[PDB]
Amino acid sequence: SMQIIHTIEELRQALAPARQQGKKIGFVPTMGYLHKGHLELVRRARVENDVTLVSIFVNPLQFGANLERDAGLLHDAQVDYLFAPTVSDMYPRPMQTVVDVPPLGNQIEGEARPGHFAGVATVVSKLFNIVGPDAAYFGEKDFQQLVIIRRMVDDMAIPVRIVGVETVREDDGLACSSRNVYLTPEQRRAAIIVPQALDEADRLYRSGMDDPDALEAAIRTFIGRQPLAVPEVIAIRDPETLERLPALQGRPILVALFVRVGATRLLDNRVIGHAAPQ
Amino acid sequence: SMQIIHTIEELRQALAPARQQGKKIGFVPTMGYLHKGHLELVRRARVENDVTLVSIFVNPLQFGANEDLGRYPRDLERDAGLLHDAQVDYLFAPTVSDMYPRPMQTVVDVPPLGNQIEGEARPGHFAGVATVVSKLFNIVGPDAAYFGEKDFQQLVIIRRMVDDMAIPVRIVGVETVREDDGLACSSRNVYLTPEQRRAAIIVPQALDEADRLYRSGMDDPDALEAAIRTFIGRQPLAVPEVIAIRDPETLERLPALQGRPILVALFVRVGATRLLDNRVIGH
Amino acid sequence: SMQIIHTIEELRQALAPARQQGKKIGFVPTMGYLHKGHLELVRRARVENDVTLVSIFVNPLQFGANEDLGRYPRDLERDAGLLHDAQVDYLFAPTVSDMYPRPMQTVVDVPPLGNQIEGEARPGHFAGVATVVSKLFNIVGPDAAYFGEKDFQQLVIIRRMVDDMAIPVRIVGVETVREDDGLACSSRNVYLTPEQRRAAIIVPQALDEADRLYRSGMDDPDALEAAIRTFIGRQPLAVPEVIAIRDPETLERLPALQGRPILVALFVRVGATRLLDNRVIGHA
Amino acid sequence: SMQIIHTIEELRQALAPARQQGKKIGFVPTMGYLHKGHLELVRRARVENDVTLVSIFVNPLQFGANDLERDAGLLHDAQVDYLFAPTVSDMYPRPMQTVVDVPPLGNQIEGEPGHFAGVATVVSKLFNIVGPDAAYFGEKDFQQLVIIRRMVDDMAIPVRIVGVETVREDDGLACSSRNVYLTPEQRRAAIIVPQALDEADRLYRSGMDDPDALEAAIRTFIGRQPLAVPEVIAIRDPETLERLPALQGRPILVALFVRVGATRLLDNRVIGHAAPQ
Numbered sequence A: 001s002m003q004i005i006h007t008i009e010e011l012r013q014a015l016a017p018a019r020q021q022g023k024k025i026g027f028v029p030t031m032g033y034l035h036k037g038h039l040e041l042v043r044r045a046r047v048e049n050d051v052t053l054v055s056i057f058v059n060p061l062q063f064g065a066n067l068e069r070d071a072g073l074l075h076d077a078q079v080d081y082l083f084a085p086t087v088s089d090m091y092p093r094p095m096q097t098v099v100d101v102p103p104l105g106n107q108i109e110g111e112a113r114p115g116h117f118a119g120v121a122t123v124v125s126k127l128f129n130i131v132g133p134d135a136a137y138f139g140e141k142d143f144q145q146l147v148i149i150r151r152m153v154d155d156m157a158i159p160v161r162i163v164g165v166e167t168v169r170e171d172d173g174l175a176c177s178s179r180n181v182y183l184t185p186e187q188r189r190a191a192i193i194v195p196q197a198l199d200e201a202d203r204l205y206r207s208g209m210d211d212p213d214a215l216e217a218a219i220r221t222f223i224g225r226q227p228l229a230v231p232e233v234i235a236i237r238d239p240e241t242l243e244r245l246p247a248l249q250g251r252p253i254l255v256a257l258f259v260r261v262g263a264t265r266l267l268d269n270r271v272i273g274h275a276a277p278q
Numbered sequence B: 001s002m003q004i005i006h007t008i009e010e011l012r013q014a015l016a017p018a019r020q021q022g023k024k025i026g027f028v029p030t031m032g033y034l035h036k037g038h039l040e041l042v043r044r045a046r047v048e049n050d051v052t053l054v055s056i057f058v059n060p061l062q063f064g065a066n067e068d069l070g071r072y073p074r075d076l077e078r079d080a081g082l083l084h085d086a087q088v089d090y091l092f093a094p095t096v097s098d099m100y101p102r103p104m105q106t107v108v109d110v111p112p113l114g115n116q117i118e119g120e121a122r123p124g125h126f127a128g129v130a131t132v133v134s135k136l137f138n139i140v141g142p143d144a145a146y147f148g149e150k151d152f153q154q155l156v157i158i159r160r161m162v163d164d165m166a167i168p169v170r171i172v173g174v175e176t177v178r179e180d181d182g183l184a185c186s187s188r189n190v191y192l193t194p195e196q197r198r199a200a201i202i203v204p205q206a207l208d209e210a211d212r213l214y215r216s217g218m219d220d221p222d223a224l225e226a227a228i229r230t231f232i233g234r235q236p237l238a239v240p241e242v243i244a245i246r247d248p249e250t251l252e253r254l255p256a257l258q259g260r261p262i263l264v265a266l267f268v269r270v271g272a273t274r275l276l277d278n279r280v281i282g283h
Numbered sequence C: 001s002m003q004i005i006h007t008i009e010e011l012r013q014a015l016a017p018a019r020q021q022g023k024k025i026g027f028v029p030t031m032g033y034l035h036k037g038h039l040e041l042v043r044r045a046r047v048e049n050d051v052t053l054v055s056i057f058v059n060p061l062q063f064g065a066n067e068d069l070g071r072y073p074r075d076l077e078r079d080a081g082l083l084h085d086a087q088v089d090y091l092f093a094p095t096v097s098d099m100y101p102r103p104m105q106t107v108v109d110v111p112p113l114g115n116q117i118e119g120e121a122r123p124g125h126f127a128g129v130a131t132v133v134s135k136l137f138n139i140v141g142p143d144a145a146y147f148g149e150k151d152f153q154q155l156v157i158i159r160r161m162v163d164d165m166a167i168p169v170r171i172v173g174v175e176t177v178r179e180d181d182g183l184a185c186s187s188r189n190v191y192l193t194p195e196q197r198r199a200a201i202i203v204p205q206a207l208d209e210a211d212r213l214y215r216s217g218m219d220d221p222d223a224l225e226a227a228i229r230t231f232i233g234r235q236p237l238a239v240p241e242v243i244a245i246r247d248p249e250t251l252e253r254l255p256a257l258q259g260r261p262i263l264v265a266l267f268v269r270v271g272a273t274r275l276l277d278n279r280v281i282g283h284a
Numbered sequence D: 001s002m003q004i005i006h007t008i009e010e011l012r013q014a015l016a017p018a019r020q021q022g023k024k025i026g027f028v029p030t031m032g033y034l035h036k037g038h039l040e041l042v043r044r045a046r047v048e049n050d051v052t053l054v055s056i057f058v059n060p061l062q063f064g065a066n067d068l069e070r071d072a073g074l075l076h077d078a079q080v081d082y083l084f085a086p087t088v089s090d091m092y093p094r095p096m097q098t099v100v101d102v103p104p105l106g107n108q109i110e111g112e113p114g115h116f117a118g119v120a121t122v123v124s125k126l127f128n129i130v131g132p133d134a135a136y137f138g139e140k141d142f143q144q145l146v147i148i149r150r151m152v153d154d155m156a157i158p159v160r161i162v163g164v165e166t167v168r169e170d171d172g173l174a175c176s177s178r179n180v181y182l183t184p185e186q187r188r189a190a191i192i193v194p195q196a197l198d199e200a201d202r203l204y205r206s207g208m209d210d211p212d213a214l215e216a217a218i219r220t221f222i223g224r225q226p227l228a229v230p231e232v233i234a235i236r237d238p239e240t241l242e243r244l245p246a247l248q249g250r251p252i253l254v255a256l257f258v259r260v261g262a263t264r265l266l267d268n269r270v271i272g273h274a275a276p277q
């Protein structure tokens, strides 16, 4: 049976026998509201580790200053431990410590801002300290986050392997997300334009397109065919630095889409192309 | 039980004790989706060494910008089941992130051997191969590594690389393992429809043709080539991008054939699949 | 024989048997040029742990653009010799390339503690410290780590960082070790010329005086600061960069002194040497 | 006393029991003409390792296609365990067809194409031959070091690469086998080299923010000395060796190539250091 723990000290004691046995611990951090993508993270973790731990915590540090279902899904997925702390279990007094990766975090949505991704980097560093995992699994769906965590892990010599899992998609191609539920039936069928826009970006790249503005314009007009879909951001960037590119061909590129359908923000991304020998 | 390992650090730690105790490590690098031919490399490795390690990594460096990297077949679960049964000690199965945490700026290449034959059709290809293989050898530190003769240019290039760079590994070439009806086993064969799979028998027969032609006393590189390019023309589906007659050692073109081994190398596309096959003929 | 190691991967491989045997690992992080204070941290570590690891690394991140990184004292042969005598099991002595093989893009900071006091005179200094200390704890994975109370603010920050980030290390503060005339032991003391070294006794003397004034009942923080300033100014070779009278836990300014403990923190420049010393005076 | 070995198979036999015992092997590759500099490289290797091995080899792959006594002497005094002194035929029995290069790094400063392929290839071969735990190089040759570090990372070569601070003469001038060629007048003029780096240091400390301004200030400073002609003043990112958009708030490489009469003198300094983000 999956054990549910709430406190840091209870988690540490719960894992002490796995540590004594030299068991590999796989960790999937989440904010709950679990869907099939989360379950594929769990499935990867279980393939590669002896023990699998999922956290559910809605972290206030990644928002501004202002469950039985989930457990059931994790129970059926054969998870060994669910860590579900309250805010007070995680933060009994306010955090004064901040971890950030400013040069990556200030890209894309991170524009020119405070630590847009400080909350994420901080809470993930803390969760790694609590869990002591061997490997941690994240969706490629949240690409910027993943690049940031990798960098943080390398810089800080955190002894955890970071595994990026390919985006899991509903059967019409729409990226799995808990926000998909909000879409009206009409909006849901319009939403298919997002994954189709990525296929179009791939087609254009394979045909030789080399100017990032031309790719952005193509994608914008493509999505625009569906008037219920308004592209808020179409980011074409280096997948390593997340910076703008002077050209596209001969190198891999990240195409990140931020698209509003009705009131709902839909996100998707794909890395297109790959590196040649020097 | 076979241990599946995903990182360079973990793999070296796993192998460190055996290496200290002088145990022989045999290594079979692959791009996965394993077939009878891979399993023969693994058997050779198993009988010849104390410790057997197989790598499964679809190496992006050896795929061109418009080739089949996106659709290259992958099934690690299946691959792993086959390797457990084969009594493999270690499966190294890294993600791209584990093999190439940063974009590679270093390249290993053997331009004389690599720019011709398949490398005319696929520029950069063998630099990708030579690079990943040098890195794999550095990671694993094997005593012996096992490559199939079906990828004959590859094998010659790796032998030369290993020699030139004084890499302390014994390189072992293993005879092309063939399906029931003579076709060279290859993961990419799964792109072929039944019709194409029937049409692909051209390629092994074409090598049997140049076999007896050489045995008949033929002696002109180009007369051997044209006899091949028309013997394969008999099957319409085949769109040869390379028919090559070469010195099996230097891969350079010849003046005459008789009384010297020649290599016949066929890069023949049928449908969406670029089928490769080779034979060394004579002595 | 003490093992001397230079790379992260090498250190983790050297400590793996220890973890396999359930040994407790004591950790003392330093910037080298070791003094008696360092050696007391080591002695304290060895009492409580099976294996003791010292790091020596002059961390560029905790030096500002125009500080003394280039001249900070270094003598690894002398340090190694002292640690061998001290029965240390591991010395981790990386170069900058071994600690930072590529430029860091990550930072750890505790801004509400780190921007006060010494942090007012050295902007960013404590982000440098938090960052390297977090990395070293990841690299070493110790059961306990030992820090001098002489760097009082640093200790407060490291304890807070450890609690905040749930880092599973016990943090031990070690009482300040002093030279015979009361000067806090510090590797930078080697900068002091004879005349500066003689003048430097004004720092511990000023803390004595702070204590004296507090015992007499002085209750006004501004008055205490002003008295300490005048007392130090009697030594023309000493220039106070910070005289801070603070809450010892929050490091914030106080309204009154009596009936609670106060931190008196002095950062005082004598020539090219900025001396630091601290004392917690009174009680709750 | 120091063994001298010439062939690959001999070198491997020599090291095999040391390697079996987990002894740490420190390796110092050279082309001979040894000075105080090389001896520091060797001192470091000996402090950090149980067995020290120095190679002397004038690699043709570095050069265009068209005294072992004094050296081995100093190495015997320095207590080196092994000298590896192959002939061109011992290293390259047949001609090399394999090439290792790090083109993005190799195509900067001195490389503008293939310029550092010779060095990468020989260092890779040497590492394969010796199988060392650590290898020591002078920071004098910065570009080389940065390239070798990248190659080792990219190729997963299990060797620690250690950069050693440039050994310097009485007056600051960088130790070099090229120094012997200066006339005494030229040698007194040559101090302008490290003085130009000090001045580089000074201008950066004073807040100079533009790399062309710095280059022109350094050009002019070296002009003060007519026996000294500056061929190249490279102000670059020490990681990528590329030109910089600005100087302040980031470390900078200042690499000088200066002509003093006939002889080429090189020196460099990384100025500044990384602050927290």
Ligand SMILES: Nc1ncnc2c1ncn2[C@@H]1O[C@H](COP(=O)(O)OP(=O)(O)OP(=O)(O)O)[C@@H](O)[C@H]1O
Binding pocket: B029, B030, B031, B032, B037, B038, B041, B059, B062, B129, B132, B133, B146, B147, B148, B149, B150, B151, B154, B174, B175, B176, B177, B178, B184, B185, B186, B187
């Ligand atoms: N029909 C076959 N018979 C024998 N060996 C084969 C056959 N097909 C492939 N092989 C060998 O199995 C090994 C793995 O081949 P695969 O196509 O999986 O990629 P790979 O080239 O081996 O990996 P890399 O190119 O990165 O070394 C190769 O050495 C290949 O020559």
Ligand SMILES: Nc1ncnc2c1ncn2[C@@H]1O[C@H](COP(=O)(O)OP(=O)(O)OP(=O)(O)O)[C@@H](O)[C@H]1O
Binding pocket: C029, C030, C031, C032, C037, C038, C041, C059, C062, C129, C132, C133, C146, C147, C148, C149, C150, C151, C154, C174, C175, C176, C177, C178, C184, C185, C186, C187
């Ligand atoms: N006089 C002293 N008595 C007791 N401990 C001291 C004394 N002087 C320094 N220390 C302690 O020795 C340890 C090492 O100090 P050092 O000056 O070498 O830099 P550090 O602060 O230790 O290293 P880092 O800042 O990277 O943590 C510190 O914890 C410091 O507080």
Ligand SMILES: Nc1ncnc2c1ncn2[C@@H]1O[C@H](COP(=O)(O)OP(=O)(O)OP(=O)(O)O)[C@@H](O)[C@H]1O
Binding pocket: D029, D030, D031, D032, D033, D037, D038, D040, D041, D057, D059, D119, D122, D123, D136, D137, D138, D139, D140, D141, D164, D165, D166, D167, D168, D174, D175, D176
């Ligand atoms: N003044 C110096 N201080 C420290 N090291 C130096 C100095 N001058 C040269 N060196 C170093 O000595 C080492 C070998 O020098 P040498 O020029 O003899 O061979 P090399 O060209 O480095 O060998 P290879 O390029 O084949 O590796 C190099 O790492 C070089 O940077």
